[PDB]
Enzyme design. Structure first.
Site, PDB file in Angstrom:
ATOM      1  CE  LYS A  45      45.217  46.051  42.478  1.00 39.51           C
ATOM      2  NZ  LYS A  45      44.053  45.316  42.730  1.00 39.51           N
ATOM      3  CB  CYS A  86      43.207  40.053  33.059  1.00 40.88           C
ATOM      4  SG  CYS A  86      43.762  38.723  32.191  1.00 40.88           S
TER       5      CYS A  86
HETATM    6  C1  LIG Z   1      40.609  45.469  47.929  1.00 36.33           C
HETATM    7  C2  LIG Z   1      40.882  43.931  46.534  1.00 36.33           C
HETATM    8  C3  LIG Z   1      41.426  43.889  46.035  1.00 36.33           C
HETATM    9  C4  LIG Z   1      42.162  42.496  45.564  1.00 36.33           C
HETATM   10  N1  LIG Z   1      42.985  42.367  43.999  1.00 36.33           N
HETATM   11  C5  LIG Z   1      43.474  41.927  43.407  1.00 36.33           C
HETATM   12  C6  LIG Z   1      44.253  41.741  42.843  1.00 36.33           C
HETATM   13  O1  LIG Z   1      44.519  43.066  42.510  1.00 36.33           O
HETATM   14  N2  LIG Z   1      44.532  40.878  42.498  1.00 36.33           N
HETATM   15  C7  LIG Z   1      44.541  39.317  42.321  1.00 36.33           C
HETATM   16  O2  LIG Z   1      44.844  39.111  41.679  1.00 36.33           O
HETATM   17  N3  LIG Z   1      43.210  39.082  43.381  1.00 36.33           N
HETATM   18  C8  LIG Z   1      42.674  40.901  43.990  1.00 36.33           C
HETATM   19  N4  LIG Z   1      42.041  40.578  44.882  1.00 36.33           N
HETATM   20  C9  LIG Z   1      41.346  39.294  45.307  1.00 36.33           C
HETATM   21  C10 LIG Z   1      41.805  38.612  46.305  1.00 36.33           C
HETATM   22  O3  LIG Z   1      43.145  38.396  46.146  1.00 36.33           O
HETATM   23  C11 LIG Z   1      41.075  37.434  47.257  1.00 36.33           C
HETATM   24  O4  LIG Z   1      41.631  36.710  46.223  1.00 36.33           O
HETATM   25  C12 LIG Z   1      39.948  37.885  47.089  1.00 36.33           C
HETATM   26  O5  LIG Z   1      39.961  39.076  47.649  1.00 36.33           O
HETATM   27  C13 LIG Z   1      39.721  36.107  48.446  1.00 36.33           C
HETATM   28  O6  LIG Z   1      40.217  36.033  49.040  1.00 36.33           O
HETATM   29  P1  LIG Z   1      39.171  36.604  51.101  1.00 36.33           P
HETATM   30  O7  LIG Z   1      38.540  35.527  51.350  1.00 36.33           O
HETATM   31  O8  LIG Z   1      40.925  36.643  51.875  1.00 36.33           O
HETATM   32  O9  LIG Z   1      39.166  38.390  50.555  1.00 36.33           O
HETATM   33  C14 LIG Z   1      41.477  41.970  45.473  1.00 36.33           C
HETATM   34  C15 LIG Z   1      40.751  41.494  46.551  1.00 36.33           C
HETATM   35  C16 LIG Z   1      40.230  43.107  47.251  1.00 36.33           C
HETATM   36  C17 LIG Z   1      39.550  42.836  48.610  1.00 36.33           C
HETATM   37  O1  LIG Z   2      41.031  45.466  40.766  1.00 33.55           O
HETATM   38  C1  LIG Z   2      40.332  44.573  40.550  1.00 33.55           C
HETATM   39  O2  LIG Z   2      39.289  45.118  41.028  1.00 33.55           O
HETATM   40  C2  LIG Z   2      40.597  43.126  41.584  1.00 33.55           C
HETATM   41  N1  LIG Z   2      39.446  43.000  42.508  1.00 33.55           N
HETATM   42  C3  LIG Z   2      39.502  41.652  43.244  1.00 33.55           C
HETATM   43  O3  LIG Z   2      38.699  41.264  43.932  1.00 33.55           O
HETATM   44  N2  LIG Z   2      40.210  40.757  42.053  1.00 33.55           N
HETATM   45  C4  LIG Z   2      40.806  40.693  41.030  1.00 33.55           C
HETATM   46  O4  LIG Z   2      41.049  40.307  40.302  1.00 33.55           O
HETATM   47  C5  LIG Z   2      41.029  42.610  40.416  1.00 33.55           C
HETATM   48  C6  LIG Z   2      41.896  42.757  39.740  1.00 33.55           C
HETATM   49  C7  LIG Z   2      41.020  41.940  38.008  1.00 33.55           C
HETATM   50  C8  LIG Z   2      40.127  43.202  37.480  1.00 33.55           C
HETATM   51  C9  LIG Z   2      39.095  42.641  37.842  1.00 33.55           C
HETATM   52  C10 LIG Z   2      37.965  43.378  37.637  1.00 33.55           C
HETATM   53  C11 LIG Z   2      38.555  45.021  36.900  1.00 33.55           C
HETATM   54  C12 LIG Z   2      39.774  45.272  36.428  1.00 33.55           C
HETATM   55  C13 LIG Z   2      39.848  46.119  35.246  1.00 33.55           C
HETATM   56  F1  LIG Z   2      39.233  45.511  34.378  1.00 33.55           F
HETATM   57  F2  LIG Z   2      39.962  47.165  35.723  1.00 33.55           F
HETATM   58  F3  LIG Z   2      41.234  45.783  34.640  1.00 33.55           F
HETATM   59  C14 LIG Z   2      40.718  43.968  37.042  1.00 33.55           C
END
Ligand SMILES: Cc1cc2nc3c(=O)[nH]c(=O)nc-3n(C[C@H](O)[C@H](O)[C@H](O)COP(=O)(O)O)c2cc1C
Ligand SMILES: O=C(O)c1[nH]c(=O)[nH]c(=O)c1CCc1cccc(C(F)(F)F)c1
Ligand SMILES: Cc1cc2nc3c(=O)[nH]c(=O)nc-3n(C[C@H](O)[C@H](O)[C@H](O)COP(=O)(O)O)c2cc1C
Ligand SMILES: O=C(O)c1[nH]c(=O)[nH]c(=O)c1CCc1cccc(C(F)(F)F)c1
Lengths: 313, 313
Positions: free
Chosen positions: A44, A131
């Site tokens: 994460k 970010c």
């Molecule tokens: C619940 C959730 C949390 C996510 N948190 C992150 C994150 O912490 N860092 C990040 O680079 N992308 C985050 N993403 C984005 C996923 O890595 C991914 O790029 C996006 O969901 C698209 O792939 P998918 O179509 O397989 O869901 C998150 C997505 C989901 C659904």
């Molecule tokens: O933790 C998330 O909301 C998130 N969700 C995604 O689908 N992709 C991401 O890259 C992330 C983390 C980046 C992100 C996305 C939106 C907000 C913030 C916050 F401001 F909380 F620090 C961080």
């Protein structure tokens, strides 16, 4: 016939891994992904300090995909660094650590401390350029000057090969500019396309309500919605960054979806929403499905078809 | 029943119309849309001169939506103006004429000629801001200084109420900037959200090929892929532009999908991909479906629920 890859000085049994944020927040999660048949795992995205994240509900899924505004809940950098330095079994598969500081300084501080662990244990950095930076400005990867500053600072502080997680783009001029910024940084060895499609809005007709609580229901989209967008980005950067690897992420539910990513240019293929919904058993299914498409086509290795999408006339 | 509404000093039998570009290129197309049950129609975005557009195949549809890189094939402004001036039957429904010149000067030239016809006949202008820009820059709607110039010049040249067709945005800061630009222009009375989601890529697994010829298979997405995107943009602009109307476009296949657009803030609801796939019969289905959902909920008017999407806390 095999799914093996050798890249970034690591060996991978297959190209499949979780997408950052899915099944990777706790020690339990990371042990689970390690026990799965995926070829790798990513932790994460973290901040220096632990975060609770946003109020619930903050993730919801549906037949065509998911929407989330999680607010970056995570156990903090020290926890993920500990997992990488002390806990992870590197004989099982390679580990990526994702970071997503709230400022360039927070990222520099993390990477400085990651670097000796990267060097000694082989953990690989994925820097998340979605970010937020200053509120009221766009996310960092949508502000090209900020993105350049982040990459300059992280490259100097870290001093080792790393990768970046990119949001999708929708305009050729943006593909051009964004790839040209990345190409300024020789330590950026991989580019993960894509993060969620930003600020969509799901509404439930029966209740006449949005489905997530933060941001008045706006959040990032994953899943089936985003597959053509994800392919476009994988291929745009594949074409523009010939000295870098591209990892694909977005809309993978099947071996066929993975096969399309790999045709587009993907080396590793990450799985978010479908993994969230199906659980880690999905990896055995995707491997089997991909291998079946390869056998039907006569392909024995991934490099026989990676990046070999055909165009018309 | 009935779904009749008044806006922009015109009466509409119902909120449905075609999306620009679909079923509205030729005199035949426009007669067919006029004969349909839609509440209004819009003509294909035009240039000063006729265009053949791009090589075929340049549109393809699939279960979840469509991809196109048409290259603005159109019969030229003189044709659409003559349709608005001499051929359209205004007793059947209102007409919108869409313009998308290749420069600000070309737009200004077209709108100076349209103004007298708008005064005489009541044809309404939709200005398509997903149009080409100067070297190195993205589409005009993605270059906020260009967008402001275009709106300044068209407002001065035209001098009458008009609307703007917008691409989707994906970042809350961009919503804030774009809405602030539009809100500088009092003559911009309606905002249509959204144009296709730009530069996706659809790949056929069997052939290992992209499915459209132009731009190496890259093109705009419509249909089911884009509904949450479209709803988010409709609601974002609805919130930010309280003295304007919002028209929704994107991913409408049913009365339920139309209901969701209206909940988000839509006054008129445009239909692109689903109209291309199903033909003009779709309009009677959408009306019946929308009225069925209203009856089940006890709503008698659209005003009762337009913009009334509920948030959580
Ligand atoms: C619940 C959730 C949390 C996510 N948190 C992150 C994150 O912490 N860092 C990040 O680079 N992308 C985050 N993403 C984005 C996923 O890595 C991914 O790029 C996006 O969901 C698209 O792939 P998918 O179509 O397989 O869901 C998150 C997505 C989901 C659904
Ligand atoms: O933790 C998330 O909301 C998130 N969700 C995604 O689908 N992709 C991401 O890259 C992330 C983390 C980046 C992100 C996305 C939106 C907000 C913030 C916050 F401001 F909380 F620090 C961080
Ligand atoms: C074949 C085709 C041609 C289009 N031409 C135009 C155009 O001339 N002007 C315009 O504003 N949008 C045009 N669009 C975009 C649509 O008006 C609409 O914004 C988009 O398709 C999203 O709606 P949908 O999900 O209903 O398809 C076109 C779309 C298609 C599929
Ligand atoms: O005709 C298109 O490809 C098209 N497809 C869409 O989904 N939306 C659109 O708005 C358009 C027209 C975009 C456009 C607008 C203005 C000029 C030109 C150019 F001449 F360059 F082909 C293209």
């Amino acid at each position: 016939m095999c799914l093996k890859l050798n890249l970034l000085d690591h060996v991978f049994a297959n190209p499949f891994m979780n997408a950052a944020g899915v099944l990777c927040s706790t020690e339990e999660d990371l042990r689970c992904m390690t026990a799965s048949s995926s070829g790798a795992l990513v932790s994460k995205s973290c901040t220096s300090a632990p975060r609770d994240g946003n109020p619930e509900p903050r993730y919801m899924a549906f037949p065509l995909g998911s929407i989330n505004s999680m607010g970056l809940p995570n156990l903090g950098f020290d926890f993920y660094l500990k997992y990488a330095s002390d806990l992870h079994d590197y004989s099982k598969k390679p580990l990526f650590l994702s970071i997503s500081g709230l400022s360039v300084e927070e990222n520099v501080a993390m990477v400085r401390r990651l670097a000796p662990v990267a060097q000694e244990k082989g953990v690989l950095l994925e820097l998340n350029l979605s970010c937020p930076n200053v509120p009221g400005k766009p996310q960092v990867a949508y502000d090209f000057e900020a993105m350049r500053t982040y990459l300059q600072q992280v490259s100097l502080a870290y001093g080792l090969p790393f990768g970046v997680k990119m949001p999708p783009y929708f305009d050729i001029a943006h593909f051009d500019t964004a790839a040209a910024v990345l190409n300024e940084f020789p330590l950026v060895k991989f580019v993960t396309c894509v993060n969620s499609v930003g600020n969509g809005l799901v509404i439930d007709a029966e209740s006449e309500s949005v489905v997530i609580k933060p941001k008045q229901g706006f959040g990032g989209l994953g899943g089936k919605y985003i597959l053509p967008t994800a392919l476009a980005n994988v291929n745009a950067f594949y074409r523009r960054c010939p000295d870098k690897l591209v990892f694909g992420c977005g809309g993978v539910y099947s071996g066929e979806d993975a096969f399309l990513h790999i045709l587009a240019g993907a080396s590793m293929v990450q799985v978010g929403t479908a993994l969230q919904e199906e659980g880690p058993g999905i990896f055995t299914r995707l491997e089997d499905e991909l291998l079946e498409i390869m056998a039907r086509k006569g392909y024995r290795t991934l490099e026989e078809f990676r990046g070999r999408v055909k165009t018309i006339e």
